[PDB]
Design an enzyme around this catalytic site. Structure first.
Site, PDB file in Angstrom:
ATOM      1  N   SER D  65      -2.061  -2.926   6.283  1.00 50.98           N
ATOM      2  CA  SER D  65      -3.467  -3.285   5.834  1.00 50.98           C
ATOM      3  C   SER D  65      -3.841  -4.245   6.417  1.00 50.98           C
ATOM      4  O   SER D  65      -5.022  -4.346   6.860  1.00 50.98           O
ATOM      5  CB  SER D  65      -3.582  -3.222   4.154  1.00 50.98           C
ATOM      6  N   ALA D 152      -6.675   0.977   4.441  1.00 49.40           N
ATOM      7  CA  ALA D 152      -6.407  -0.560   4.257  1.00 49.40           C
ATOM      8  C   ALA D 152      -6.867  -1.119   2.901  1.00 49.40           C
ATOM      9  O   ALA D 152      -7.933  -0.643   2.415  1.00 49.40           O
ATOM     10  CB  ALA D 152      -6.954  -1.430   5.343  1.00 49.40           C
ATOM     11  N   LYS D 153      -5.881  -1.520   1.986  1.00 52.72           N
ATOM     12  CA  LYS D 153      -6.087  -1.811   0.453  1.00 52.72           C
ATOM     13  C   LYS D 153      -6.784  -3.160   0.093  1.00 52.72           C
ATOM     14  O   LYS D 153      -6.139  -3.903  -0.156  1.00 52.72           O
ATOM     15  CB  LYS D 153      -4.633  -1.571  -0.054  1.00 52.72           C
ATOM     16  N   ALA D 154      -8.114  -2.910   0.336  1.00 51.33           N
ATOM     17  CA  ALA D 154      -9.101  -4.076   0.694  1.00 51.33           C
ATOM     18  C   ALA D 154      -9.910  -4.548  -0.342  1.00 51.33           C
ATOM     19  O   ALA D 154     -10.623  -3.773  -0.978  1.00 51.33           O
ATOM     20  CB  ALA D 154      -9.691  -3.657   2.062  1.00 51.33           C
TER      21      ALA D 154
END
Ligand code: CL
Ligand code: CL
Ligand code: CL
Ligand code: CL
Ligand code: CL
Ligand code: CL
Lengths: 295, 303, 299, 299, 296, 305
Positions: D65, D152-154
C-alpha cells in the site's frame, strides 16, 4: 382479436371464460408499468402426448420477478404450475405458448399506491436471419431490474424492434451502455468462433431459460462456453451467430449490419445445438426427461 | 372500495361511457409490454366560483407528443381531446379534480413487435398535503438510478418509465421519508420520483438541466413566474451536497404543486422550514391556478 | 518542522502553546480520512493594516463542510471568525496563511464510531505569477461527485491531489491538471482552472471541481469589468488552442499557465485578460477597493 | 478513550508507553489523507496458545500500500512482523486486533510536501454471525479505480465507507452494500461480498473492490471443498434472488446476509454453503487445521 | 478521377502541376492517421472566412505538435493563389498537412511535415424542402480519446461508418449521439433545433467547433434570437418546432424527419428559413456588416 | 527515407519498382483515415531457413479488417499470402518486417465517397534485434498515459485501421517526451488496456493475468503467449486490471509483433518486483523465441518458409 376467443383463462384462482378475463382501464400496471410475466412453451412429443418445457424454472422465475418488486403473490408455486397445465388441458391445446402475468390492480392509482390487489392470469394459444444493431441502448442495471421479466422493460424492445423492421431487417441487436453487445430485443445472443461458443456475460442481458438450456447442451456436447464482453465487430468476424428465446428457440443470424456472418449459412455448431434442443423438447432425451411436464 | 368501482362517466375511444364499462382484456399489449402514455392534469375551483383546467393545451400537446415519440398513431386530434377532457369534468360534476388521459395499445396481437393493434384513448377524472406545503418534507436520496436518455425516451410520458419511480418511492417510504430524490447515471441530482427539483442559493434559482428529467409543465410554470419576479434561473449540474448546503429546496409537479423540502438525507435544508423565495413562488403559483392572475388568465380553460 | 515552533494555536476553545497542539495516533481522522479544513489569507493592506480576505465565506464553507459530513461542530461561526483573528493577532503575524481544521478524535477507533469528540484547531504562519507556469495533464482522474462529496473540503480528497501533483513534478512540470471521469478539464490538484478565448473567460462548470472562493472572487471581478464569463465543459485541446489560461486558489492567487502538455498557450507568457484580473484581485486584497471593502476584516 | 490507556505502542523503531504515542495537529496525513493501515487478528488456538492469522500476508499488503503511494517505509518486512508480535506479547494480549499504521509527518504542510518523515506505529487491543444481518444498498457509489488506488488501504478511502455506513445505520440496518460506478454490486463499507447460487460461489471480480485477506482465505477454502468460485459482475436483483449471500472481512470474519433492501435472501437465515465456509474459516483460525498451519504465527 | 486532372496544386511551398502532387505508399499519415485538413469555400458574390479556416488548420497541427514550416499568411496567400491559378470561381478549397515518409514507426520523429492545397468547382431541394435523417448506432468520439478540436484524418472513420449506415437504408444523413446518449452532430455537420422561437445546439463538447456553426450563431444573435447551448435528447428532436444542419458543404440544411418522425410541419421552418437567408446574404457579399468575412 | 530505396513493392496485383509505388495527395484514406494494415515478421530459423510467423492469421485478420469497414478487397486470401512471400523472396530478405496495407483511392474525395478503388500494397524491410536487445533482456520503463484508449462503439477496435493510430501516436509521444520508453493506456473506465502498440500482461503468485479482450487489440502475439503459457501449465486469467495491480505485480510485460515479448521493469516510477526480467516472463519469452526460430514441433504450422 386475442380478446375475442372461445376458451378458458385462469384468473385469480379459477378458470373463467376467455372473454370474461377483463379489467378496468384504471389498473395500476397499465399506467405505471410494474407487472411481470412469462412465456412458456408446450410441445407435442414423440409420444403423441403434450408436455410443458421447463415449467418449474419458468414458474420460479415468475415468482422471483414478483419478489424483486415486493409483489406478494397470493398463490404458491405448485398452484401456479398446476394452473398452467390446466389451461393447456382445458383449451385442448397441444403445441402452444402459455402467458402467465401478474399485475397490480385498481384500488388506488397514485404511483406510490400500496394496498392494490396482486392479480394473476394465465392464457395459452396454439404455437438464418438478417439483423441490425439498434441505435437504442439496452437497460442500465441500476435503473431497471433486469432479472425481473417486467412489463415496463419492453418499451425499449419495442423501439429497437420497430427500428430494425422499418428498414427491412428481421430483428434488432442491442448494445449496452458501454457499447458491447447485450441481446436482441426478445432474445439472448450467441456467437461461434474457432469452435468455441461465446455469449455476453449475464450483466445487462436477461437471464434466459433457453440460454441456460443451450449453454448446458453445449457443455454436454464438449463445446467450451465462454462468457465475456463482445464487441459488435467480433460478430462481424465470427464464424456463426444465433439468437435464443422461448418463442423462436434457436434462430441462426446470417448477417449483422449488412456484414455476412461466416459463409452466410447456418453453421455446424448452430445445427448441432439446434438439434440437441429439438431432441430435448420432443422428449427424445433420456438425460433431460425432468425438463418436460406432461399435461 | 376501488377506482374501478365508481359511478360517473369516462370518455373512451370517441364517446362518454359509464365509468365501470371502461374495461380492457388482460391480453392488452400495454399491460404486458409497457408502451402506453398518459397525462396528469388538474382542474381548479377558481376565485369567481367557477372551474377551469390548468394548462390544458400544453398537457394535451405533451400527451400527443409522447404518442408521436412512440409512433403511436392517435385516432383523435388535439381539439377533440381538449373538448373530451372538459366534457369528463363537466359530466362528472367535478370542481377541484385530477384528470388522467391515457393512450395505450390494444388486444389484437400480443407479440412484442405486433403491429396493427388498436390505439385506444380514455379519460377519467376524480376529486382532488397541507402540512408538507407549509412546513416542508423529508426527502431521502435513492439508491436507484434515474433513467438513461438513450434507454428510455424521457420526454415521452410512458407507463414503463414508472417502474423506476415506484421502486425509488417505495424505498424512501419504507424507511419513513416523505419522498425520494434520484441521481442520474453520472451521480448528479435529477428529480424526485414524480416531481422536478429546484434549489435556491444566494437569491438565484437552480434546477437540473433538462437532461435525464421530465420536461415538466409545473416546472415551466414556476420558471416563468421566477423570471417575472426578476429571479435569475440557472440550469446546471447539481451535486447532492449542493442540496445539503443550499438556502432552500423544493419540488414541482401537477400533483405536488410547489412542495418545499426541509431536509435531505437527514441534513437540514437552510432554516429547516419553507424558504422565502419558495414561499413567493408557491404563492404566485396559487394565484395563477385560482384565477387571480391577469397575466396568465390564458392558462386556465373554463370547464 | 511545522510542529516545532513558538507561538500560539487555537484548539478546542482556547489559545495554547504551539507545540502543545498534539493528538494521539489513534485519532479517527488519521485512520479514516473524515476531517475538513480551510485555507485563508491575511494581507498587509495599503494603509499598513493587516486584514483577512473573505473570512465570513471561508468560515461558512468550513461549517458547511462539517454539515455535509454530519459532524456537529461545537462552536458557532462568530466564535470561529473571532478565533481566527485572535491567532493572527497573538502570533504577531501580518501577511500570513491560516489553517483551521476540524477532525474526529480518539474515543473510539472503528469506521462506524459514533460519540467521538469533534476537535477544532487553528494555526497560522507567514506568507510564476508574472511569468507563467508549465502544467501537465494527470493520468489520474478527478473525483466522482457521488463517491466523494466535492463541496466538502475534506482530508481524504487530497490523496488524489497528491498523486497528480507528484506525477507532474517528478517529470519536471510545475503543476498537474486533472480531467473528470468523462475526459473534460476539471481543475488543478489544488486550484480552479480558467481559460480566455476571444475576450471571454471560460471555466469548468461547478460539477466535479471545488467551489473555490478565489474562483468566485475572479468571476465577480470579471463580470464587474464587463468580461463575459461562461461555465461549460472544456476539452483539453480547447486549452491547447486558447489565448490564455490560469489557475486560482487561496495560496496561488491568480497564476498564469504558459504551457500545457508542452503546447504553448497563446504567446507563451501572461496574457492581457489574466493581467487585468490579477490587477483587479490585488486591488481587492490590498484594500484599495471601496466597492469590496467588506471582503476584508481588520485585525 | 483509546488514547487514554495502559500498555505499549510500537512507534518508529521501539516500544513506547501507550499515551506517549502522540503527533502534532499539523501532521500531513491528518490534513490530506495519504496514510495506510492494516487490520490484523490474533486468535486463541485449540492447544491453548495464541497466534496471529496471516501476519506475513497482512504485512506484505501494508508495504504494498505504501509502495503504491511511493511512501518509503524505513523498516523492512521482517522488522515489522517481529514488531507486531512484540506488541501482542508485551501488552499481555491473547485474542486481539492489531493496527499497524503508516503516515506522513509534520515537516511541511503543503499538499505537495517532499521530505516529510514516514512514520509507523502499531497498537493492539482485545477482540448475527448465526443467522445473519440486514443490509441496505447505499445511495453513495463505490470508488472509481482511477480516482482512488483501491488496492492501497488508504486513510482517505474510508470517507466513502463512513458515509454509506452512517446512511444504513441511521435507518436501522446493520450494514451498507455499495454499487460501483456502473451499477453492479461492489462490496460492503468494510467487507467483501459473496453470493451463492445453485451450489456455486460468486463474487464481484477484483475490480473496484478491496483485495481481501479474509476474501482470499475463504476462496481458497471454497476451492478445497471442491466449490466452484466465479468472479463476475453481479446485479442487485441477482442478490435478491440468490440462494445465499455473505460478507467477509478481518473484523466481520464471515457474516451471513439474511436480507437486502427488505428482500429476504433464500429462506432468510444462514445458508448451507455459508455455514460450511464459516466453519472451515473458524477451524483454520483456531489452529485445528494441519493443512493450513503455516497461516498461523505463535506469539 | 481526382488524381488525373489539368491544374495546379501548391505543395511544400511552390505550385506544381496537378498530376505531380504525389507521395509514396509508405507515408506515415496513410498508415497511422495523423494528418489535418480544412474545407473552405469560395462563392460568387470571395473565399469565406479564410483567416478563420487557416487559423483552425494551424491550431489542429499545434494540438498534434506538428511543426508547420509556413506561417499563416503564406498559407492564406497560397489558398488565394490556388483558386486563381485554376481559374476557379465557385469552388471548394482543401488544404492538407500530413507526415511524410522518413520513418514508418508509430513513434517516428524526424518525419517531414508536408502541406498541399487543392481546389475544384462546387442539393437545392434539400436546402429548400429539408432532408431525412437517421440516428446512427455508432457513437460519436470520446473527447479524451480523440482530440475533437483537431480536424484530423483519423477522426473520419467514425463519420464514414455512420454515413454509410444511414445511406444504405435510404436516409440522406446520419445523426450521432455521444457516449452519454445525447445528440452530438451529423457525420460532417453541426446540429441545431428550434423550439418556441429559441435556437438550441449541443454545447461545444464532443462536437466539432464549426465555422458555419459560429457564423449561424452570430447571425441568430444579431437577429435577436436567443441561442442556448445545452444537452439535447433524441426525443427533444422528434418534438422540436424545427431542426437543421450546418457545415461548409451543408451550408444551412433543414431536417424534415428524424428516425421516420416528422419534424414540425415536415418542411423548412420559419426560423430556419430566416437563418439560411441571413447566411446566404453574408456569403454572397450582400451584407456590409460582415464584409471582413470575405476575401476577393 | 522509406520512399527512396531499391527493391520491389507488390501493388494492385504486381511487383513494381519500390520508388514507383506512389499515390496522389488526393487519396481518400490520407484525408479520412479509413484504411487497414498489418505488421508481420519473418525470422531466420534453426536450419538456416527463413519463415514468416503466423502468416495465415495475420492475413485473415487483414481481410477481416476490410470486412468490418465493408471494403471490397479485390484479391482472395491465397493470392495475398503468396504475395507477401513473393515480396520477402524478391527483396532477398531474412529476419525482416512485412507491412501489407489496404486503402481507399483517388476517384472521389467526399467523406462518403462510395465509388473509389480499393488498392492493396505489400512492402518488407530488415530487422536488427541488437538495437532493441537490452529492453528485451533488462526490461523497460513505462508511463501511464493521460490519453484514454478507444471506445469500442466509436472505433471498431478489431479492425487494425490507419485512423486508430492517432491515439497511439499521442500517448507514445507523451511518454517519450518525458524520458519513458513506452506508454500504458487505460480504458474509458480507468482499467489497464494496452500499450500504444502492444498488449499488456502481469504475473502474480505464479499466475498470468491480462486485460480481457475488450477495448484492447486481439493481438496475434498476445494469442501466441497465452497458448504457450497454457501449454507450460501456467494459469491464465483475463480480467479487468487496475493500475495499482501492476505496481504490486511480481512481473509485467508487453507483447506485440515488433515488441515480441518485452519485460516491464517499472511503471510510473514504481519498480515491478525485483526490477529485472522475472522468471515467468523469461520462460515465456524463450518459448516465444523457440517458436519463431523454428525450434518447436508443436507449432510448426505457424511458420511458412
Ligand atoms: Cl417469449
Ligand atoms: Cl401528476
Ligand atoms: Cl489553499
Ligand atoms: Cl478490519
Ligand atoms: Cl467540409
Ligand atoms: Cl507491429
Amino acid at each position: 382479436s386475442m380478446a375475442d376467443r372461445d376458451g378458458k383463462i385462469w384468473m385469480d384462482g379459477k378458470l373463467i371464460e376467455w372473454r370474461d378475463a377483463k379489467i378496468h382501464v384504471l389498473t395500476h400496471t397499465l399506467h405505471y408499468g410494474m407487472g411481470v410475466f412469462e412465456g412458456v412453451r408446450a410441445y407435442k412429443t414423440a409420444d403423441g402426448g403434450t408436455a410443458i418445457f421447463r415449467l418449474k424454472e419458468h414458474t420460479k422465475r415468475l415468482l422471483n420477478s414478483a419478489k424483486i418488486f415486493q409483489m406478494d403473490v397470493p398463490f404458491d408455486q405448485e398452484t401456479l404450475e398446476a394452473a398452467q397445465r390446466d389451461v393447456v388441458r382445458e383449451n385442448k391445446l397441444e403445441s402452444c405458448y402459455l402467458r402467465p402475468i401478474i399485475w397490480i390492480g385498481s384500488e388506488k392509482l397514485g404511483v406510490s399506491a400500496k394496498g392494490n390487489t396482486i392479480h394473476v392470469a394465465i392464457a395459452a394459444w396454439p404455437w438464418g436471419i438478417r439483423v441490425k444493431t439498434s441505435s437504442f441502448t439496452r437497460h442500465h442495471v441500476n435503473v431497471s431490474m433486469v432479472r425481473a421479466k417486467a412489463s415496463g422493460w419492453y418499451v425499449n424492445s419495442i423501439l429497437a424492434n420497430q427500428e430494425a423492421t422499418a428498414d427491412g431487417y428481421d430483428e434488432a441487436l442491442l448494445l449496452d451502455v458501454d457499447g458491447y453487445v447485450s441481446e436482441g430485443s426478445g432474445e439472448n445472443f450467441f456467437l461461434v468462433n474457432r469452435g468455441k461458443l461465446y455469449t455476453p456475460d449475464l450483466a445487462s442481458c436477461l437471464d434466459g431459460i433457453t440460454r441456460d438450456t443451450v449453454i448446458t447442451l453445449a457443455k454436454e456436447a464438449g463445446i467450451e462456453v465462454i462468457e465475456k464482453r463482445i464487441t459488435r465487430d467480433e460478430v462481424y468476424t465470427a464464424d456463426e451467430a444465433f439468437f435464443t428465446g422461448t418463442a423462436a428457440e434457436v434462430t441462426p443470424i446470417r448477417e449483422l449490419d449488412n456484414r455476412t456472418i461466416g459463409g452466410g449459412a447456418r453453421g455446424p455448431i448452430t445445427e448441432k445445438l439446434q438439434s440437441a434442443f429439438f431432441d430435448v423438447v420432443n422428449g427424445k432425451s433420456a438425460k433431460h426427461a425432468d425438463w418436460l411436464t406432461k399435461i
